[PDB]
Design an enzyme around this catalytic site. Structure first.
Site, PDB file in Angstrom:
ATOM      1  N   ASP A 113       0.846  -1.182   0.000  1.00 53.33           N
ATOM      2  CA  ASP A 113       0.000   0.000   0.000  1.00 53.33           C
ATOM      3  C   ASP A 113       0.885   1.236   0.000  1.00 53.33           C
ATOM      4  O   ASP A 113       2.094   1.134   0.256  1.00 53.33           O
ATOM      5  CB  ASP A 113      -0.905  -0.024   1.252  1.00 53.33           C
ATOM      6  CG  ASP A 113      -1.853   1.141   1.391  1.00 53.33           C
ATOM      7  OD1 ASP A 113      -2.309   1.663   0.349  1.00 53.33           O
ATOM      8  OD2 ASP A 113      -2.164   1.515   2.540  1.00 53.33           O
TER       9      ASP A 113
ATOM     10  N   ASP B 240      -9.087   3.814  -2.264  1.00 54.79           N
ATOM     11  CA  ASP B 240     -10.033   4.207  -1.229  1.00 54.79           C
ATOM     12  C   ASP B 240     -11.299   4.776  -1.799  1.00 54.79           C
ATOM     13  O   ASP B 240     -11.459   5.990  -1.950  1.00 54.79           O
ATOM     14  CB  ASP B 240      -9.359   5.137  -0.216  1.00 54.79           C
ATOM     15  CG  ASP B 240      -8.138   4.537   0.454  1.00 54.79           C
ATOM     16  OD1 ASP B 240      -8.069   3.291   0.571  1.00 54.79           O
ATOM     17  OD2 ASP B 240      -7.231   5.307   0.821  1.00 54.79           O
TER      18      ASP B 240
HETATM   19  C1  NBV Z   1      -3.942   7.086   5.530  1.00 57.00           C
HETATM   20  C2  NBV Z   1      -3.142   5.920   6.106  1.00 57.00           C
HETATM   21  C3  NBV Z   1      -3.035   4.749   5.130  1.00 57.00           C
HETATM   22  C4  NBV Z   1      -4.372   4.327   4.558  1.00 57.00           C
HETATM   23  N1  NBV Z   1      -4.419   2.996   3.924  1.00 57.00           N
HETATM   24  C5  NBV Z   1      -4.785   3.163   2.505  1.00 57.00           C
HETATM   25  C6  NBV Z   1      -5.234   1.891   1.798  1.00 57.00           C
HETATM   26  O1  NBV Z   1      -5.702   2.164   0.473  1.00 57.00           O
HETATM   27  C7  NBV Z   1      -6.313   1.194   2.607  1.00 57.00           C
HETATM   28  O2  NBV Z   1      -6.766   0.023   1.936  1.00 57.00           O
HETATM   29  C8  NBV Z   1      -5.761   0.831   3.974  1.00 57.00           C
HETATM   30  O3  NBV Z   1      -6.798   0.219   4.727  1.00 57.00           O
HETATM   31  C9  NBV Z   1      -5.262   2.068   4.722  1.00 57.00           C
HETATM   32  C10 NBV Z   1      -4.555   1.644   5.998  1.00 57.00           C
HETATM   33  O4  NBV Z   1      -3.291   1.079   5.741  1.00 57.00           O
END
Ligand code: NBV
Ligand SMILES: *[C@@H]1O[C@H](CO)[C@@H](O[C@@H]2O[C@H](CO)[C@@H](O)[C@H](O)[C@H]2NC(C)=O)[C@H](O)[C@H]1NC(C)=O
Ligand code: CA
Ligand code: CA
Lengths: 858, 88
Positions: A455, A531
């Site tokens: 990610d 997201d």
């Molecule tokens: C803002 C902090 C990181 C956010 N992440 C982005 C990712 O696309 C999501 O799927 C995750 O659940 C999230 C947490 O690691």
């Protein structure tokens, strides 16, 4: 979204410079006296008539109907970036021959025809033809612009600021751009990632499509803002032909699309590097898919478990929560292959570690999941907490493997773990180090059933301009971040996948989910649309987003089921499970502040509909697996727009509320609250379609109004296809992977059908290193169903047998006879429904590895 | 001369089948009653005898799935997972 955090074209000084050049007579001309022709290439110098800057055009004809155009400075101050590691091979060339020449023009024949290229000297132009048909022109609107490297050190051409961030820009303006004209083309596709329509829109009145890997919080729909990934590949479709343009550039890129006897013009504008473009001349869309796969490779064959259902959220709290979620699936008779661990599982966002309160015994947790024949996925991001007690940080700092600023010190951003540094994944040694970190010895607490999620690999830098890395940060070889930005993510994905392969001694296939991506990312695993939000319109957009990815080689796509942000109403969650059940990557995931949404927490009607969706997906795993094998071998997309199977049907060109899986299933998921029916377009002159639930036959082309209930998933099987299923739905794919197959034969109006089936051990490279697999062809014609080998090189020891055959569109036979070498002739009992024309053959009982035939006697 | 044994009737009366169709790894009854010992029926159940302890019924889909469902391990008889008796 907060749009003010992200540059519009006007706020990107190179986009503003390039975009200000309007259609006219190009100042570029070719100097035909400098022309040189070899067996592999034609080269010629180009000059800008005003500045007198000299460029070199390298023009190549390529095998498989492609043309490559490369333009660089003749005498550069410093070398320009050329994208590495994306191309799988040096493309095999085709000889260009001079078949015509005058003072201002050279006509070139590619090999022995029919392709031809016309180079016009003044103004510089290229025309690509097949015999007498003009396919495409280059620089037809005179929009070519190549900003040469000036002496190191108007508005924002050098030092440039955006909000509070400054770019020292030592090389000043170096952007490159070129336009292409597509006569007869009105429909263009691709250039993901945008939360926009499958058919791309004209950009004239607004913003160009932007390609710059970015983390866009609460991204909105139907707009050209750059999202997490960038694939600089555009496909063009008409009734007559298919073309593709592949702009091989890793820098920030803007794409303008305009139309005008119908014609679409495309302009690409990149911050740095060279002009390197592939024109893929088809003529069919399948020819373009092959052409592009020959350049960047094919979809990596997913281990079977990764094609099952994935359960995730931010975050499962601890080992007890993971084990209750696992037990929850089994207590509620819902299948699941993988349970995911987001950022809260690690010790304070130090990747490759475990929080000792929440997860004190990771190997024991993994052992429990292995006893249920399930896997786990752990998040591993490319930002390392600056902490002298963290071994990963110490090793990277000590070996100088971090991305640097201009003064030579390690870049530090503010990220998930506060002050963090970014490993330079462009460095081959850094990727080897990263791969080696996945060994069971180095990644303590990991086991063979632990897979990985990458990610925030854009990279996402919380305190950075546009939430990313400064343009003037420095990478391997001295290249600036601006030169390499869009391949950073790909390299993270590549290194992670190689880590999972290496840790097993090269035997096990990897599973890695990546947010960021580029051309070539298909080679490393899965991607998702980031997201999204728990809203009906985001449910809808999952189709055009994953189709735009499929068209450009990224077959293993999905969107978070239920939506990432906010709480979906139960009905939306159900429709999302149904949609996701028919999309390649199938994962439920949710943001930190959402309510728990494991599917058994809902009222029984909603649980039942979800269970039905999951059963449909699990039963179709042999079909999904075969489609992925076809993608891996041929480069054909798994999830397809209808126009791919119906290229001459103009009414399919913009369809994005339906899709096909291979050539066999047409899906129109319910995507509106309170819907009681859907309008399904069933294409094809003389095609038939079977409602897979009712077995009702429908002739194409028609628009059918189909009634729906909460449990309905509108799916139609095409006449002429054979779909393999595992009808015995168990708790995970590992449980099912040795089970008997049911073949669903949908007869065409000619009483014919065909389909393939790929089988292997479900997880290793043994299919390629030992030829341990099966590729079966099932064919029906006249009154006989036959199984034959579709690849005799593949042999497999397997207990898999054919337990049942379901034939849609068949009369009632008098007798059913099975023949197979080594057995006496067998008589099968059968059941027939005269109302539906459905014939069920009982227990053929034959090995899937054997050739056999079933004859229907009248 | 020789009297034949009678066939099997599904508990739901939907059909009558020979006894070589009982536990033959193909589902012949709509209620799943011809396959109490296999994974062939989607609505069947397998009885964990659990000799000496409380008997349990499990889903047919859990017979030879490679997971130990019965404390006596009798659900895994031809799968490659060897289940230990954990009934105590
Ligand atoms: C803002 C902090 C990181 C956010 N992440 C982005 C990712 O696309 C999501 O799927 C995750 O659940 C999230 C947490 O690691
Ligand atoms: C390369 O181009 C040629 C010419 O466009 C392709 O051959 C044609 O294919 C169509 C079917 O799509 C036929 O109807 C034509 O008769 C063919 N023409 C010729 C001249 O052969 C060819 O298939 C393409 N090859 C690849 C590998 O993409
Ligand atoms: Ca039976
Ligand atoms: Ca079991």
């Amino acid at each position: 979204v907060d749009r003010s955090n992200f540059k519009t074209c006007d706020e990107s000084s190179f986009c503003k410079r390039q975009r200000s050049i309007r259609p006219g007579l190009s100042p570029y001309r070719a100097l035909l006296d400098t022309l040189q022709l070899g067996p592999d290439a034609l080269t010629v110098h180009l000059i800008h008539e005003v500045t007198k800057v000299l460029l070199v055009l390298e023009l190549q004809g390529l095998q498989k109907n492609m043309t490559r155009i490369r333009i660089d400075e003749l005498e550069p101050r410093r070398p320009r970036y050329r994208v590495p590691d994306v191309l799988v091979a040096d493309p095999p060339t085709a000889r260009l021959s001079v078949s015509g020449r005058d003072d201002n023009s050279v006509e070139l024949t590619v090999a022995e025809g029919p392709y031809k290229i016309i180079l016009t000297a003044q103004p510089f132009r290229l025309d690509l033809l097949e015999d007498r048909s003009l396919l495409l022109s280059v620089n037809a609107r005179g929009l070519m612009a190549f900003e040469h490297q000036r002496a190191p050190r108007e508005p924002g051409a050098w030092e440039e600021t955006f909000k509070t961030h400054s770019d020292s820009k030592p090389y000043g303006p170096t952007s490159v751009g070129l336009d292409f004209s597509l006569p007869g083309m009105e429909h263009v596709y691709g250039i993901p990632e945008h939360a926009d329509s499958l058919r791309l829109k004209v950009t004239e009145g607004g913003e160009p499509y932007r390609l710059y890997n970015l983390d866009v919080f609460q991204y909105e729909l139907n707009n050209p803002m750059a999202l997490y990934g960038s694939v600089p590949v555009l496909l063009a479709h008409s009734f007559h032909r298919d073309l593709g343009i592949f702009w091989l550039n890793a820098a920030e890129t803007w794409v303008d699309i305009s139309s005008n006897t119908p014609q679409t013009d495309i302009r690409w504008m990149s911050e740095s590097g060279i002009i390197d473009v592939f024109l893929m001349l088809g003529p069919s869309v399948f020819d373009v898919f092959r052409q592009y796969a020959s350049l960047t490779g094919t979809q990596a064959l997913p281990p079977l478990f990764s094609l099952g259902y994935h359960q995730s959220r931010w975050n499962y709290r601890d080992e007890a929560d993971v084990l209750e979620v696992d037990q929850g699936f089994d207590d509620h008779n819902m299948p699941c292959d993988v349970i995911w661990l987001d950022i809260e599982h690690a010790d304070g966002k130090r990747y490759f570690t475990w929080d000792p309160t929440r997860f004190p015994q990771p190997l024991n947790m993994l052992e429990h999941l292995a006893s249920k024949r399930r896997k786990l996925v752990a998040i591993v991001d490319p930002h390392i907490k600056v902490d002298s007690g963290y071994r990963v940080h110490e090793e990277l700092r000590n070996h100088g493997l971090y991305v640097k600023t201009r003064d030579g010190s390690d870049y530090e951003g503010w990220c998930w773990p506060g002050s963090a540094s970014y490993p330079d994944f462009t460095n081959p040694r850094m990727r080897a180090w990263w791969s080696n970190m996945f060994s069971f010895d180095n990644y303590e607490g990991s086991a063979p059933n632990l897979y990985v999620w990458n990610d925030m690999n854009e990279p996402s830098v919380f305190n950075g301009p546009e939430v990313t890395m400064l343009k003037d940060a420095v990478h391997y070889g001295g290249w600036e971040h601006r030169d390499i930005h869009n391949i950073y993510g790909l390299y993270v994905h590549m290194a992670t996948a190689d880590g999972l392969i290496q840790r097993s001694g090269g035997i096990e296939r990897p599973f890695v989910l990546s947010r960021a991506f580029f051309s070539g990312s298909q080679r490393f695993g899965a991607v998702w649309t980031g997201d999204n939000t728990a809203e009906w319109d985001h449910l809808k957009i999952s189709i055009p987003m994953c189709l735009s990815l499929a068209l450009v080689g990224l077959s293993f796509c999905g969107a978070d089921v239920g939506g990432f942000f906010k709480n979906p109403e139960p009905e939306l969650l159900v429709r999302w499970y149904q949609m996701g059940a028919y999309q390649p990557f199938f994962r439920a995931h949710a943001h930190l502040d959402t309510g728990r949404r494991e599917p058994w927490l809902l009222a029984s009607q909603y649980q039942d509909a979800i269970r039905d969706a999951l059963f449909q997906r699990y039963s179709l795993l042999p079909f999904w697996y075969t489609l992925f094998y076809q993608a891996h071998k041929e480069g054909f997309p798994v999830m397809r727009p209808l126009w791919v199977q119906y290229p001459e049907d103009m009414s399919t060109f913009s369809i994005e509320d339906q899709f096909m899986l291979g050539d066999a299933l047409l899906i129109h998921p319910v995507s509106d609250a309170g819907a009681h029916g859907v309008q399904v377009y069933l294409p094809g002159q003389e095609e038939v379609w079977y409602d897979i639930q009712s077995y009702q036959k429908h002739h194409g082309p028609q628009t059918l109004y189909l009634p729906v209930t909460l449990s309905s998933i509108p799916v139609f099987q095409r006449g002429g296809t054979i779909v393999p299923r595992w009808m015995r739905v168990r708790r995970s794919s590992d449980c099912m992977k040795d089970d008997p197959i049911t073949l669903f034969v949908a007869l065409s109006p000619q009483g014919t059908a065909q389909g393939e089936l790929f089988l292997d051990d479900g997880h290793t490279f043994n299919y390629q290193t030992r030829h341990e697999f099966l590729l079966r062809r099932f064919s029906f014609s006249g009154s006989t169903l036959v199984s034959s080998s579709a690849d005799p090189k593949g042999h497999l020891e397997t207990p898999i047998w054919i337990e049942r055959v379901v034939i849609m569109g068949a009369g009632k036979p008098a007798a059913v006879v099975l023949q197979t070498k080594g057995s006496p002739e067998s008589r099968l009992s059968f059941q027939h429904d005269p109302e539906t024309s459905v014939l069920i053959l009982r227990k053929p009982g034959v090995s899937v590895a054997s050739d056999w035939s079933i004859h229907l006697r009248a | 001369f020789y009297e034949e044994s009678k066939p099997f009737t599904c508990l739901d009366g939907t059909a009558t089948i020979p006894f070589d169709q009982v536990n033959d790894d193909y589902c012949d009854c709509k209620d799943g009653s011809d396959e109490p010992g296999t994974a062939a029926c989607p609505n069947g159940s397998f009885h964990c005898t659990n000799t000496g302890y409380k008997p349990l019924y499990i889903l047919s889909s859990r017979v030879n799935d490679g997971v130990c469902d019965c404390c006596d391990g009798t659900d895994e008889y031809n799968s490659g997972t060897v289940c230990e008796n954990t009934c105590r």
